[PDB]
């Protein structure tokens, strides 16, 4: 579905503190009110190799880390070094190696559906680490992955960028109130991790962890917006938190505001 973001995709373009300043930056951003593809995190396995056109905005309304991690590279066949950001319920294992990628690298656990148990049909997410150049595992933390349906409060908005060989990940855990399509609001994304990997990324792919007769499709979806070189006018409050932004090319009124 061709969903449209409203004011999401705003992240701190740098590490500078500004108070009560209307700074204007010319950096990669998600254009306001832009068509963002809507997928079905489910026989029908939605998991393609979507293009990575100089940045990607990833958002989702999943819980317990349904979408584990991501794959980056240009060949994605172990012929060229490829990043593997495969996350689990404990910690991320960010790893750049010429890892061999299976055609269907997804855990496939039919957990708590009929048998009321956690069973692992196969473990083909990993195929082989034939050749590697760098790896980094973070601390074994524990995110709020515990099963709590209630009302979704995990809008794990993400932004991935690759400039001058540096891989940047901006993220922010913004709780929401409506389980329906992306909500209305404003929330800047703080930087999370930076890496001097330096490889060339042309495509990217998502990873999932979840026979065809009467299969109850999983209820989860993730959006994939695209960044684009644009000029924004960011408002910093007294505490130096971006409270509002203006897309200086959205419409004549916004252009005047920026001017």
């Amino acid at each position: 579905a061709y969903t449209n973001s409203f004011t999401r995709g705003v992240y701190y373009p740098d590490k500078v503190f500004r108070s009560s300043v209307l700074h204007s930056t010319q950096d990669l951003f998600l254009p306001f009110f832009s068509n963002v593809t809507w997928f079905h995190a489910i026989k029908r396995f939605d998991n393609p190799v979507l293009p990575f056109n100089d940045g990607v905005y990833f958002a989702s309304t999943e819980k317990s880390n349904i979408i584990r991690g991501w794959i980056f590279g240009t060949t994605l066949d172990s012929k060229t070094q490829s990043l593997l950001i495969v996350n689990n319920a404990t910690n991320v294992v960010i790893k750049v190696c010429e890892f061999q990628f299976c055609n269907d690298p997804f855990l496939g656990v039919y957990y708590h559906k009929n048998n009321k148990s956690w069973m692992e049909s196969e473990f083909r997410v990993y195929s082989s680490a034939n050749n590697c150049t760098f790896e980094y595992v973070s601390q074994p933390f524990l995110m709020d992955l515990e099963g709590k349906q209630g009302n979704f409060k995990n809008l794990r908005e993400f932004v991935f960028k690759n400039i001058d060989g540096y891989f940047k990940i901006y993220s922010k855990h913004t709780p929401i109130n409506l389980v329906r399509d992306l909500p209305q609001g404003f929330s800047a994304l703080e930087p999370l991790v930076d890496l001097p990997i330096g490889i060339n990324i042309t495509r990217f792919q998502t990873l999932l962890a979840l026979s065809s007769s009467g299969w109850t499709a999983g209820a989860a979806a993730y959006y994939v917006g695209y960044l684009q070189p644009r000029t924004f006018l960011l408002k910093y409050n007294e505490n130096g938190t971006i409270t509002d932004a203006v897309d200086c090319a959205l419409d004549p009124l916004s252009e005047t505001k920026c001017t």
Binding site: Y12, K15, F17, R18, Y136, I199, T241
Partner: protein, 393 residues
């Protein structure tokens, strides 16, 4: 003024700026240390023709503990120097560790004769990688002789340089110089493959406050006065900029605290003098500076009068009120007058707008002049200035 006589007035002179007292450098802690210790203290290396290669990257390749150690016999850098090693950043460093007979150490030199050289590990003429060789006779010498390091590298098939003489009887503790086993490690590194991620350790100095110093925070260099700040940076923010996009706050990398930055005090210096012929006495004004700092750059003083326009030196302060003579600013004027008698000196005062007057206005009172005076006054106005034609060419 390029003159030997100066007229009454106040003249600007060389600007005054407080110089930095000391240089302060702050950097994050050096924690990610490369596996140099394990690479150089391995129990045993592979064969000379099967030298083991270990990639060293994403760390600090400190050499202080390396060079200073006296346990080494030979260590030469043919492309770099230990002095500049710390101040150089490497993209990636590879360590090739192997054990060879003492004689082969000569062959290890780049561009040296001996087919063994290019059979096992050839060194190209442009190899800048540092090489470390240290005697390990006891470690690598067996009682009966270590024959694993066979030296039959005369294979019929030719092995070209970087394609990818059985004079040793047995390594014994009695082996003389040149024949004992030697532990050789090569510090081969490359560039133009990835963003730089290997750099030498960076020193750190102590922190000082309320003193004009030359700071350097994570490569952010500048001069100013560091002061404890009440600002609240976010965890990921380092610097603090102003409306004019000028740095004004900083976060100390070691201790996560926010320090304000204030430019070192500075301002113009003005000399207040009456006519040269009248006298040679003068008084100086340090514009926009309090003279708790003036003596840094008449140092003794004996007359300091803090005014809103800067501290005044050499002028007596009197709370009479006269017509302004030499303007100073913020409602202060200077003049040359006697009285205490004699000792004609320069005085400072708050200028007087004029004699107070109170008209005797009343409901039914009028004052009518009974006499007049004819007054003639002169007014001057420029009308033109000298013509001037210039031949540009």
């Amino acid at each position: 003024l390029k003159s030997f006589t100066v007229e009454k007035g106040i003249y600007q002179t060389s600007n005054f700026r407080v110089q930095p007292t000391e240089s302060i450098v702050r950097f994050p802690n050096i924690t990610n240390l490369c596996p140099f210790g394990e690479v150089f203290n391995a129990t045993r290396f592979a064969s000379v023709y099967a030298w083991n290669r270990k990639r060293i990257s994403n760390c600090v390749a400190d050499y202080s503990v390396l060079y200073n150690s006296a346990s080494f016999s030979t260590f030469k850098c043919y492309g770099v120097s230990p002095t500049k090693l710390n101040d150089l950043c490497f993209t990636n460093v590879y360590a090739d560790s192997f054990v060879i007979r003492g004689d082969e150490v000569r062959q290890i030199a780049p561009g040296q004769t001996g087919k063994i050289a290019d059979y096992n590990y050839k060194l190209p003429d442009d190899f800048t990688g540092c090489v470390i060789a240290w005697n390990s006779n006891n470690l690598d010498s067996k009682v009966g002789g270590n024959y694993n390091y066979l030296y039959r590298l005369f294979r019929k098939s030719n092995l070209k340089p970087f394609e990818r003489p059985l004079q040793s009887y047995g390594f014994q503790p009695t082996n003389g110089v040149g024949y004992q086993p030697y532990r050789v490690v090569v510090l081969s590194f490359e560039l133009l493959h990835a963003p730089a991620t290997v750099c030498g350790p960076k020193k750190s100095t102590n922190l000082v406050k309320n003193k004009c110093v030359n700071f350097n925070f994570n490569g952010l260099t500048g001069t100013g006065v560091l002061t404890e700040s009440n600002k609240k940076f976010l965890p990921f923010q380092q610097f603090g900029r102003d409306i004019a996009d000028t740095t004004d706050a900083v976060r100390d990398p070691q201790t996560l605290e926010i320090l304000d930055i204030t430019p070192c005090s500075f301002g113009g210096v003005s000399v207040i003098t009456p006519g040269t012929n009248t006298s040679n006495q003068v008084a100086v004004l340090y514009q926009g500076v309090n003279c708790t700092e003036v003596p840094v750059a008449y140092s003794t003083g004996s007359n300091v009068f803090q005014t809103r326009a800067g501290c005044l030196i050499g002028a007596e302060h009197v709370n009479n009120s006269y017509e302004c003579d030499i303007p100073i600013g913020a409602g202060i004027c200077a003049s040359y007058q006697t009285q205490t008698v004699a000792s004609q000196s320069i005085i400072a005062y708050t200028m007087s707008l004029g004699a107070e007057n109170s008209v005797a206005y009343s409901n039914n009172s009028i004052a009518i002049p009974t006499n007049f005076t004819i007054s003639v006054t002169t007014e001057i106005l420029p009308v033109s200035m000298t013509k001037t034609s210039v031949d540009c060419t």
